[PDB]
Design a protein around this nucleic acid. Structure first.
Lengths: 153, 130, 173, 106, 204
RNA sequence: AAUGGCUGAAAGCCUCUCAAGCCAGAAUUUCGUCUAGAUGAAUACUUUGUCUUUUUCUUGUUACUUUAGUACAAUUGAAAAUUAUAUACGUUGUAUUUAUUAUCUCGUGUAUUACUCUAUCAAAAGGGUAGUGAAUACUGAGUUAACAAAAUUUAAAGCAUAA
RNA sequence: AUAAACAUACUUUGAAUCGGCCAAGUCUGGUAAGCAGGACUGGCGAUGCGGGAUGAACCGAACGUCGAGAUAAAGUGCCAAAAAGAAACAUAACGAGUACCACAAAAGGUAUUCAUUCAUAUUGACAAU
RNA sequence: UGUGAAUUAAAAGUAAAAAUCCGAUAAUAAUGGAAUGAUAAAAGCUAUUUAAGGUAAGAUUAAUAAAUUUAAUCC
């Protein structure tokens, strides 16, 4: 288990600076104890970022914090992330070309929505802060004169 | 005729070092290159020291009745009596000094609203002109 | 430049061991201060290190490094022609501060390196005792001059851009 | 979509007057004018992303990359040392290199 | 990325050699430079002293065949190119590529008369020169040595100042109108919610 | 240029200046003139109008021929001059790359633009007029994103006809 | 005192070599010589590497194949990897600019900067009127 | 009449805060890396016991003091 940085606390807002969702903003719920990766959600109704796991080295801890208790994380453990993962077609399992992944997304889609009951609390709170919903849904960018060694979050 | 001189009592502005953007008062002139600044350490925090004129800038204020080699105690009385801090903060440099401190504590969210808000205001102000 | 207080005594047949040689030597470090100190003994009293004991070698610090003083350094230096005695005045706040001015000024005007100069003495003179034509103009109480052609100051190397934008202006400052 | 990198110029390898060591490449990150602004970037990812005009029938990618890390400063003018998986091609001097924001220690 | 922009340098009130050192270093760094008004540069020396150096320069010429000899270009835009080329790598692909990204013109041709101009504080004549040191403009020296087009550039520059002077005045009027329209809506009652944020950070 | 002079300090006078500023002065230098000359420009006709390569016909060139692939109008970039700079202020403290709130739909008119396009007067213009579209502000509301994918920048074969 | 056991003492057999050249806080002949000949040491020869642009001898340092780090001589406007600040006497001149090194003398200047000595320095020195 | 280098009286002060200069130093440490490796238990580290010790400096109080002076009991 990694030791998370002191700036990363539950409910804080993080910026994803690498990977598929690069430049997006998310909300840090808790850390996967079985893998050490953060479990974040850039609430799907706002950013479209689903429930996922990201290593703490690919995120920046912003000072903006959504807090939010009663998040109802009863599921969303190492079982859930291993349940919705799309696995290959083994080696000796005939050929099963192309179609295997398309069916996988269809069958795992239902459980993905089911666990989005977590987002029901942060979404309501986020709209309370003026300009925050626009801030969350918008990509993070480095403008002119934005020197990273001078920026502070 | 030149307006700002390097005299005794002239209020100067440190531009580099550990006391950058801090006010100081000239109390002695060693030669054409070095002056003795004693911007009251009890007020601004600039210790009595010799500095090169390349590191400071002049201002439009001169403290009244400052003699060369004035002590720190009497110098402090003349500094508050003139109210240099009150007068300096209303100048173009004075407001530029406080602006830099205001901007250096912004966060990413803070810069987000300002860029969004100012863009709309500037666009709207351009519309209003025929 | 740092100032040192060095003492020693000579313990042999020629010298009685009850007379202490003191000095005030300006050297970059205490090893050079002793080296200068021993030479003055050997070249003036036939006292050699192998027959002498050093007693104290302590730094000397300025009492008031906030008061402007006019100094007067009496010194002798060696040229191509011969050996001369000079008396140059300096304005500074420390005794060591003025000596570094003298060494840097001699090496520029007279092209004399440091290993040709012996500092005989250094005192503090009055305000009217200054005779340097340039330095005499700043000893009065009503000195005043505008620094023109000011180059704009940069807070630190952080903002030192190679190419700038727009135009460049000096400052009446 | 967004700018998540700072352009750095591949000036050249670590060298002397008449020698050259292509193991280490020198970069000039934009906005870093002094060596005291270097500690932020020591360890950040650096990528040299180039383009190759591949033929239609070839399965090789048309955009390839070489990655690396900034390891130490080099001089007082904010020049860094970067070591890559493979040494950069000397034809790429004066080109731009993406300096990312990870591994993040913020 | 790929820097397709051009860094326009206004050579007015600069030093010829100091400009070249900064430009010739950044040509090797992938930047494209255009130095407008390369005839307004300054070189240390009175016109009498500058002609002696040129007379020495013109002497260098292949004895058996002057057509092969050193070519002495009198145009100021070619004095700068020669000075820049001396600070670039010689006889390699790296040196030739970096030279292709440099151009002077004596005035300001059609595309580069409306681009943003830059300056080189290291090369400014007000930072590196004693004010009483006599200098010489490149155009003034070029006329002395046989550059015929010193009058065309002076005529073309004259009409470029008259066109920019009226454009600047028209732009000033519009900017004053927009500035005073911004104050009216900054003080409006409906925009207080937005302005209160701006006042917090000192923008307004 | 050598040289002879003008005004003129340093140095209250004097002085052509190892000072600033000027004049006159060579078989001199540079323009002007003569010879060779690189990158070029204008006009005439033939074409073409997003683009390339491999082939291929010809004495050779261009257009041309075939099979594909590729993009499809709409926020980029200018005060000048001086610097002992009229007075005031010193406006401090990061040039280019690199300053747009994810996509789409629903909406009302007005206004704006170094925006696009059409017509016209002009024009070796970030031109005027008239209209249209685009984007933005007034200023909203609503849908979607989870796995996957988000790329041109150019390849391959010909000679019917015309200049 | 210090150092020394792969120390110390050797024995036998034998190779190649005895044209040498260079430097210098050294000398003799010579007007002098990149000339001729010597005393002591270190080198080149037999030796590459980093620096002096280039160089048998100069400076640092002597080499199995490599990775990383501090360094040496010496450098830090561009070629060229690497610097910012301070004070001065210079610079209206092909003046100045990395020792050996690839050159400059005597002499003169009311040119300039600094220091010493002497006299006049006021109730009034010098220049002019 | 004003400034004032220096000195002097009283208050405060057990004479270790913070900042700058001047001296003094560089290493114990903390956080990020880089080169070459290793992966398993420890003369590891941690918890519980008694107790050699803590030489300005583990703490406090006492006598007094220009003290790396002497005691006491706590840790």
């Amino acid at each position: 288990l990694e030791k998370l940085r002191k700036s990363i606390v539950p409910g804080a807002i993080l910026i994803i600076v690498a990977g598929k969702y690069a430049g997006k903003k998310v909300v840090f719920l808790k850390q996967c104890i079985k893998s050490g990766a953060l479990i974040v959600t850039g609430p799907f109704k706002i950013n479209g970022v689903p429930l996922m796991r990201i290593n703490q080295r690919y995120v920046i801890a912003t000072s903006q914090k959504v807090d939010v208790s009663k998040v109802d994380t009863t599921g969303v453990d190492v079982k859930f992330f291993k349940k919705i993962a799309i696995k290959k077609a083994a080696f000796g399992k005939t050929v099963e070309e192309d179609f295997a992944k398309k069916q996988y997304e269809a069958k795992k889609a239902l459980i993905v929505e089911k666990q989005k009951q977590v987002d029901e609390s942060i979404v309501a709170e986020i709209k309370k802060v003026p300009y925050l919903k626009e801030y969350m849904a918008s990509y993070f960018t480095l403008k002119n004169g934005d020197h990273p060694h001078l920026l502070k979050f | 005729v030149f307006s700002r001189f390097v005299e005794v009592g002239r209020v100067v502005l440190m531009k580099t070092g550990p006391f950058a953007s801090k006010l100081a008062v000239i109390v002695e002139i060693l030669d054409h290159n070095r002056v003795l600044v004693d911007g009251p350490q009890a007020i601004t925090g600039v210790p009595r020291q010799v500095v090169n004129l390349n590191t400071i800038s002049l201002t439009s204020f001169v403290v009244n009745k400052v003699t060369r080699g004035m002590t720190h105690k009497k110098l402090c009385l003349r500094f508050t009596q003139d109210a240099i801090i009150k007068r300096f903060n209303k100048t173009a440099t004075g407001k530029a000094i406080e602006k830099r401190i205001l901007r250096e504590k912004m966060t990413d969210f803070d810069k987000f609203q300002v860029s969004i808000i100012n863009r709309k205001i500037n666009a709207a102000a351009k519309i209003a002109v025929s | 430049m740092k100032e040192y207080y060095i003492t020693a005594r000579c313990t042999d047949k020629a010298h009685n061991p009850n007379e202490i040689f003191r000095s005030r030597v300006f050297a970059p470090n205490y090893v050079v201060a002793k080296s200068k100190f021993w030479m003055m003994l050997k070249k003036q009293h036939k006292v050699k290190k192998i027959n002498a004991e050093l007693l104290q070698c302590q730094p000397i610090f300025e009492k008031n490094p906030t008061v402007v003083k006019n100094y007067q350094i009496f010194l002798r230096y060696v040229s191509a022609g011969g050996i001369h005695n000079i008396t140059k005045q300096y304005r500074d706040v420390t005794r060591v501060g003025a000596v570094r001015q003298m060494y840097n000024d001699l090496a520029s005007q007279y092209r004399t390196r440091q290993d040709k100069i012996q500092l005989i003495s250094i005192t503090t003179v009055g305000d009217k005792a200054v005779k340097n034509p340039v330095l005499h103009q700043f000893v009065g109480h009503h000195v005043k001059f505008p620094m023109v052609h000011c180059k704009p100051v940069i807070a630190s190397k952080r903002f030192n851009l190679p190419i700038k934008a727009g135009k460049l202006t000096t400052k009446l400052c | 979509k967004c700018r998540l990198h700072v352009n750095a110029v591949f000036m050249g390898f670590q060298r002397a007057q008449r020698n050259q060591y292509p193991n280490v490449a020198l970069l000039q990150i934009s906005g870093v004018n002094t060596k005291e602004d270097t500690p932020f970037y020591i360890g950040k990812r650096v990528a040299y992303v180039y383009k190759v005009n591949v033929k239609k029938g070839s399965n090789k990618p048309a955009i390839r990359a070489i990655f690396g890390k900034i390891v130490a400063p080099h001089g007082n003018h904010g020049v860094v040392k970067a070591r890559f998986l493979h040494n950069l091609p000397p034809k790429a001097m004066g080109q731009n290199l993406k300096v990312f924001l990870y591994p993040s220690n913020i | 990325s790929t820097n397709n922009k051009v860094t326009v340098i206004d050579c007015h009130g600069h030093v010829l050699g100091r400009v070249a050192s900064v430009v010739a270093k950044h040509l090797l760094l992938g930047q494209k430079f255009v130095l407008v008004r390369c005839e307004d540069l300054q070189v240390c020396g009175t016109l009498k002293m500058r002609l002696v150096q040129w007379e020495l320069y013109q002497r260098k010429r292949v004895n058996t065949n002057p057509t092969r000899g050193a070519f002495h270009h009198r145009s100021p835009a070619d004095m700068v190119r020669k000075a820049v080329r001396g600070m670039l790598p010689k006889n390699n692909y790296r040196g030739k590529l970096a030279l292709k990204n440099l151009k002077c013109f004596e005035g300001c041709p059609a595309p580069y008369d409306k681009m943003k101009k830059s300056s080189i504080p290291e090369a400014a004549a007000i930072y590196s020169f004693n004010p009483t040191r006599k200098r010489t403009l490149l155009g003034e020296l070029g006329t002395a040595v046989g550059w015929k087009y010193a009058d065309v550039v002076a005529k073309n520059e004259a009409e470029r100042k008259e066109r920019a002077a009226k454009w600047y005045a028209a732009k000033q009027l519009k900017q004053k109108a927009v500035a005073e329209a911004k104050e009216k809506i900054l003080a409006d009652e409906k925009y207080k919610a937005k302005v209160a944020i701006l006042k917090k950070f000192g923008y307004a």
